[model samples]
Target chain A: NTYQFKNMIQCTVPKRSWWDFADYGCYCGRGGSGTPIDDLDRCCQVHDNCYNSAREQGGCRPKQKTYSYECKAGTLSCSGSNNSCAATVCDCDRLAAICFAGAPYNDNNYNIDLKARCQ
Target chain B: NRWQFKNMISCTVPSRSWWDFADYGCYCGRGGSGTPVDDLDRCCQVHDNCYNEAEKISGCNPRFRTYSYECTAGTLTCTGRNNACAASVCDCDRLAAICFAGAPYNDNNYNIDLQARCN
Candidate 1:
């Protein structure tokens, strides 16, 4: 058993980076979102812009490049292949042009299907 | 004015990437963490390991890499310079071997002194 100074930070986080989702999230709406294939960073929001369907992982904001960047940039390096899926709080807002404090992850009940779907 | 939308997703987040902090966070404890100077991704935690003196920004976990690259393969472009600082929730644990699901950021009351100190 491991002993330490404090409790482990426990909260559900997205199994994959928003970047990964961008890479494949709106694969069909790239042209509609005005996203160039070369721009890996802006593609997700771009795609999000085109698709506003009320489906899981649906919707985007055309003028919301900054918001998407905050999500994409916060992506961290986690260990373990157990990239499973679950739900948690996250910044899945498909709107807003600029980012604000308490913005990156302020939404609750975000859908996340890890290894199986996120991949 | 925006309409037909949802509330903005606003939450305190680290201004700069943890990778940037890793470059300068643990500047004095490279050798101890078994981290190489070239390893910009794992320095802050190294320094944090050396100086858990119990002060503001005074702690580190050797297991926690300063800049985790597990998610993105390094592909993003962040804009704007209004880089400021504030305190909020963050994943500041220093233990845990492989990355876990609810592990990226789960802790609250985290100290964040952006451009002023975090820089």
Candidate 2:
């Protein structure tokens, strides 16, 4: 007979940039509805299209969800995790990030009515 | 006939921001080739678009060139020159300024750049 020792360890994933998600709109970390309200929103629209196209072509995978890990002593241990992506997906994000940097931030971009009108 | 006194005065207009021109690309003060290289370039591309649209709608006029004035006493005087723009044009610039402020500055942005990029 043998006895096993265990140690509990918690691991948290790194946070992603605002542009990391294709579904989200002009507002960072949130989703929007309708047509893009401003140039910034247009950037998001283009990014979303790129991502969607990549998926349809099987050139990229969906963004991975953040994951937590538990470690067990002498049995299993957590080291590290990488949220890497395919080259096509990376290019999509690269272009989108550039678009966001240059697009003007406008109050109209946040207008709910304008966004709703898009639909 | 009466004799008049004259004074030679040199006046330099305020420098315009890099985004002032609609044709230039990612690089400040100059133009770029293909797609924007990074986030900062994208910001410029958006700004260019804004300025172009403003012109197409006749909402804004082309940016004024810096001009020098001469002064003469008792007959002619040069107090100052106003390089102001229409409200629509002002809005375009204001939004572009905000976009540049938040965008990340990258090496690709300054391959052959000025003030180190502002100068």
Candidate 3:
């Protein structure tokens, strides 16, 4: 059978404002120790906050696993398949993408040191 | 002064597969510990993969912030400013929307998502 597992977890916390990169940490992915090095980083922060807020809103469970057949053979293509939990996440990601579109650019933003610091 | 920030982050990661929510994770936002409970969730996974693929493609920078004047004050709306960075992001979102559009409706898949998802 085309089995695809679905993991569900609980939601969590939330923010905005004077927006200190130091307090918030710059960068979008894992391990970042610098403040929003740039506007793009700021967008990431916004995204992070959005996620947090989403968790706070509830509707999500914690450490739960489900199943499905959304993916094709040898392909992991499963999204929007479950709106119950994906809505908030998709919204946050979408907004982040929009934010990134308008933000500026920088090279140092992705430095390993910066990410390490943020983590 | 009305100032807006722009951030640039490096791209990363990639995916696709047999699909295993147990290994992957369900829901979309935080940790909803459940597989795609429905088709809507499937769409979410698809979107997630799209984003992952986008990051792996490169072009994105990390921790880089720039400046601009896109927001309208009293409201946070800064999208579609820099085509260079926003294009891929936009494309992915558009596709997601389209995906959601075609997917079933369960008080989810926003109107646009419905239309786009179906298209």
Candidate 4:
């Protein structure tokens, strides 16, 4: 079962890269390839500023670091149980994938606020 | 904040033990503390029988095995974001706490039965 599932996940991922928006990191500068701009899934002022700077300036250089790659968004699924299936999440910004058993689905602990319940 | 939360959880855990059921393993048998009786969290007939056999016999020796101990059930709580707090869960069988960040909570990908929806 694991062998079968292992074989299936190999085909689904769309390779991409994940960015660590660090100071002095390399960006699509004026001289090289055009900077491919994208939005973050959530709002963060720091991330916003980082993107803006990269876009405005030709390209920014990373400060003695390596940029990692990941898979594109929305390309992972889980199925079955008992080591029967596996899923892989490709990084959005890097050429990488995180594979494991079990679907991303899990049970959420249902919590009741004591004050609210009493009221 | 993390330090404060760490201190809190340390005080709350009640030391206890959990069990792993296996073939030819030690149980609270007749000679062993009168086969300490307890029920599985679920209706497991095999486990029920295991307990019964241990209770009936004297010192049912384990077959070259190991037994694990754990804390009692009904403990562990999580708190805050940005590494603010931690929690743990003990169990009747064993305190094998399966944990995840994000409070074991997430978007459940609310399914839309479009076939039913259209109907």
Candidate 5:
């Protein structure tokens, strides 16, 4: 009944060039129509940042690299290198989303502290 | 603003071969039949019977293999002057056990009443 409560989430809505919500999931410093942060729930971050693929170990399709992992101040972070991935972080505000558009960003450049648990 | 509560979860516990205290933390699934019913999602309670009176007793058995089993009550029940299953009474309460097994039957053909926070 009621689809047995399957967790089918859908935020994959399309966006118009002149639409609003510019800072939803913003991760870069590029100049857009509005605040980039609004675009957050709209885009993905580094490593396994793809919105639709967040549950996958490495993340969706592997073709879309922006997995949606959140930044927990003292527990995690993402790389900010041009390659944007040099180490796992404890504080991430991705600076990599601005570059990927028509092209896919499928490189896995994220790492987390293998030993930092409950700290 | 508080920077905590990042994806906090009660967390999942690893069960050893379906609650085997001896070697805990392990399990799998089936496809041929069975509703993926963790505990008794398939069978009904056979009150005061051989096995857990509350476990779903499959009418078809349906080429089903045991996905997981816990031997609590770990004792034997007297039926026809002998122990039917290796254990009896489940060393635990079947109603409560099934709930923990992920298939709490609030009512109706195994449907559970869960409070989800989705709009």
Candidate 6:
């Protein structure tokens, strides 16, 4: 909980850091909403233009190679599992594309079992 | 309250009269989803059959008319106000068939959102 201002600005939350808090809830893409794969972060996150339907545990957003990291061009990690495949490649057309967030879980966290559109 | 009663029982050893109320909190059988109709008895007949937990409240199920519930063969307590408008929260495990009068209930997680079934 982050508060602002001087008087009306007051927020009190449990003891937790941004990384801890975000990581805790972010692991599954905002409370079990991320797609987890066995492939490296780059490979799994790559846009193969092929629809992915492996969001049984979290969710299936899609594999759109349209996400090129212009900002990550200079300072992004490469050796870690959190590797930014979107950043390293920096080529949208050359990447893969997969449709996600479809009819099924296309609903929300409440409907994690919803069907996908492409994958 | 139960904890305090348990302490008294430990000290008093054995005495039936010593126990005024065994169970605490009212048993609102078959609730979570929909507005309550005037018919209280008819609604609380079927058990809520939830397909999943994250989508629907853990113990909430709703029918088009009333909220049903399940009670083991014993002296369990239940309360109701209208048909399909009853509360059947603490019944059924593999069988929470208590269909509330409407879809969704008062559970903070699924207030009036949890539908009748998942599948």
How large is the interface RMSD of each prediction? Answer: 21.1, 19.9, 17.4, 31.4, 22.9, 18.9
After aligning candidate 1 to the native by TM-score, how far in Å is the CA of B84 from where it should be? 11
Q: How well is candidate 6 docked (DockQ)?
A: 0.02
Writing each residue's lDDT as its tens digit, candidate 6 over B3-115 gives 32223233333232212211111112212234332232122223222222222432222222133332344222233542322242322221222222222332332211223
Q: Which is the leading candidate under TM-score?
A: 3
TM-score of candidate 1 restricted to chain B? 0.19
- Residue lDDT tens for model 6, A1-119: 01110001111121222122111111111112235322222222333222222211122222322232212322222222322333233232122211121112111232122112112
What is the C-alpha lDDT profile of model 2 across B8-100, one tens digit per residue? 101111133221221222333222335665565676666556655554532123242222233333222322452332443444444444455
Q: Tell me how far the alpha carbon of residue A109 in candidate 6 is from the true structure, in angstroms, after superposition.
A: 14
Per-residue lDDT of model 5, residues A1-119, tens digit only? 00100101111122222112121122211111122222342243342233123222321122213323333332223434412221221111233222222223221211111112102
lDDT by residue (tens digit), candidate 3, A64-92: 22322232332333365646445555555
lDDT, residue B53, model 5? 35
lDDT per residue (tens digit) for residues B1-119 in model 4? 21222222233322311111110111211111112122321112333344334322232212211232222344443322211011111111122122111112112211111122212
Model 5 chain A — which ten-residue stretch has the worst lDDT?
A: A1-10
What is the fnat value (0 to 1) for candidate 3?
0.00
lDDT, residue B2, candidate 3: 6
How far does residue A98 in candidate 6 sit from its true spot (Å)?
A: 9.9
Model 4, which residues run further than 4 Å from truth? A1-119, B1-3, B14-119
lDDT over C-alpha atoms for residue A5 of model 2 = 9
Q: After superposing candidate 1, which stretches have Cα over 4 Å from the reference?
A: A1-41, A45-119, B1-38, B44-119
Candidate 2 lDDT at B114 equals 20
Q: What is the lDDT of residue A107 in candidate 3?
A: 41
